[PDB]
Fold this protein.
Amino acid sequence: DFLLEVCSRSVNLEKASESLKGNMAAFLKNVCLGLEDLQYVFMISSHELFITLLKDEERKLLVDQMRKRSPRVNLCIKPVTSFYPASASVNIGQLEHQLILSVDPWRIRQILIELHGMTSERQFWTVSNKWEVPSVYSGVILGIKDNLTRDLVYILMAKGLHCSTVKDFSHAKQLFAACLELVTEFSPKLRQVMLNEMLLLDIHTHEAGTGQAGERPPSDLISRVRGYLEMRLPDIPLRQVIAEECVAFMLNWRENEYLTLQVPAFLLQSNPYVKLGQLLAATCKELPGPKESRRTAKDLWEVVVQICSVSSRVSLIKQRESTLGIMYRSELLSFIKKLREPLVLTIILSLFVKLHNVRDITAEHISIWPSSIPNLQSVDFEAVAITVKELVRYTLSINP
Amino acid sequence: KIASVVGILGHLASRHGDSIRRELLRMFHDSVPFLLQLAVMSPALLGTVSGELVDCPAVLSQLQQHLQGFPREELDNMLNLAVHLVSQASGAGAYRLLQFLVDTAMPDTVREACDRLIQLLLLHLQKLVHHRGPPPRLVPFLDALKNHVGELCGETLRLERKRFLWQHQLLGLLSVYTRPSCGPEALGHLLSRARSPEELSLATQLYAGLVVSLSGLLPLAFRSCLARVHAGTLQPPFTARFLRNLALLVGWEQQGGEGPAALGAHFGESASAHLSDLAPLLLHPEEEVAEAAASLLAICPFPSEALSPSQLLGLVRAGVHRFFASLRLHGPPGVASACQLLTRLSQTSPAGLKAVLQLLVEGALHRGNTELFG
Amino acid sequence: TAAEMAPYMKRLSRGQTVEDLLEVLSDIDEMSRRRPEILSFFSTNLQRLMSSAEECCRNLAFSLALRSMQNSPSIAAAFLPTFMYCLGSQDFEVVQTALRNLPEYALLCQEHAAVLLHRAFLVGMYGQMDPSAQISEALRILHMEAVM
């Protein structure tokens, strides 16, 4: 408004000729152009000099061409539905469509309650084949005696898992929380199963939204990951992806002190993921050591070359078995693809480059690995080449 | 069960009969449920599927309304037989009979019967597509519709009073049903052919109905659209429409309220994966394509990890070219998108800032673009 | 039939590792050598695998795709956007394996061959590739069925 008031006092209208008026109106137009906020564009446009100077036909053109710079967009997000309920089957199909479209667990419970109310003995976990519950959970989830409870637990698990797949973490959190608080009453095994699922969902939610800018975990998720790693409960159905993601979570947040020292001994002999994470943390924390690094870099070298070796035409990529390691090569590649920590990634790159250079490529800490290997004939160097190419592609996707 | 034996005999007796059975059905339609019941298990329904739409005109509708003196329970049984036959019998003229049925819904009792026929068909298809959570069910009606998905999207985008609800539901059912997941293709057609926010709302509604059962739809839709853009396909009006609709979607998500939060589409994140494809579109000879690409890239977020030096340098070169081209053509009002893109690129890294400043000053001092500055 | 190929569609669509994708593509490959007509069900999924990052499943995707297109010339126009995407891809291996299969695809398509060989030239010209042998072979054979 000081600029506009100086503009008003310095023009001397009805005596300023065409030259000053055109220059001054062009200046007002071009200072309207540079305004990032549109309220300032109406602030200049509402001034008497701005209206007086230009025309009565280009002011509207300018204000609409500035309004279209950052337009307000409105869009419907509710999916289409032609719900015109005459017969029982029409109402059943209508409520099944609502159930499949639904993501709020309380609405799902309402729909399932009235669906069991109308029908006699029909199950309703089967009204969509896109609902996938993992096969380790299918037996424990279809053994629920109550029909409505079994249906509701199956639907909540399936929708929570699919929401975690499509990165809908808040809705998955609501669905898993509802399923957990529903199975606290009648099943400790299901309570434990959705505890594990809730932990995995919390890990994914943190690594998607709460991470991504370099801030630490809230230290209760770290305690939960520790407790799940040190769990040792045999009756519960376990998914190996949860333990794999827990080890990846520990590696991604430089929890080398837990992975090297504070890990229980029985976990290393049972889970290959924990053993590999311990070895990676050990070879990462010992990097400023000249010879102490070799003691763990060696063990990482043998375990990785035994992963990438073939026992007994045979190709490691074509067969995926007859490998000597604690892991398949696919599982090792997927586990590394769960890692975003740059030091761990460059350690694995140096390892696989040194393995590839045997039968050159320079990759940082390449001297920490042994050169002479045992069972060189067992190593599928084609598989090593494919692994190092996919690994460098993944790391360049992590940090271009 | 003499009707079953008669149908079993007539199924074998109808070998290579392409005119006699049609003539018998035409003569029997002059004065029907007995034929339809035995036609469920025979390909004569598939053969007469094309002839049913051509034969039916208003005189046959008035005759059916005159023959509608059957009890309402028998009428509902005949309607269930009709939806079963059209769902599991229609082989190649499914789109023509579909357009006839939708067209014969907009004698009022025949319109009501066709409306109930379409609603019951949609409910039956919703049952057949996804059930028994075992090999998948094969729906012959929807098997003939994957080749007409573009026409279905175009008819849905007309946005009439009632037809677009049915065709949108059928698009969603087709997207769920197809094992190769034709959903990204339909979403791409809707994005590339929408002209209004009302027409753009159909894509968001389809994705909202699809994200509850399918995953990764937007990256595949974007890849298919941009592959068609970079080939000779998708003539540049549709390219500009797709680019400005995607800009509308990304901006709508950026002004996030309850809408983008409930949808959870991640339009900007999925569009960020295709900046190497969107950057050459600033250099497009068509002006509308170039300005739509500029408006998209001014607000499209960068990839969360970083920008590659090749990606960053290509983006900066295309941005400064777009800036000078829009300064020459549209003057100072037309450079807003390029200025926003270059300002965002300069804040990514000191290398990006140095690239933006160096290329801007060098382009401004070139033998070209120097008459702009005297 | 399309009912017996649904698990193969599911394995090819959900293949994350190179091992799973390679084994399902090879399993499609033997019974494509037996029954060539089954490849029409795998069309767009081979188009997705056409621009794969690694080499063996990408080469197998080109092989199975071109085998599918050897039967029906109408399939040839449907592979145009993915082939021109492979020619103009940022990945250099994908560009090389698209240039190696360029004359066979140009022979198979023949209504989009001008745009295809123009894209191959401009990839060779503004890149650092020499597709002049492939372009010359494609132009020679295209002339041979042009004079017929």
Q: What stands out?
A: DSSP finds nine helices and no strands in chain C. Chain C touches chain A at residues 16-20, 22-23, 26, 53-56 (CB under 8 Å). The CA atoms of residues 7 and 45 of chain C lie 13 Å apart.
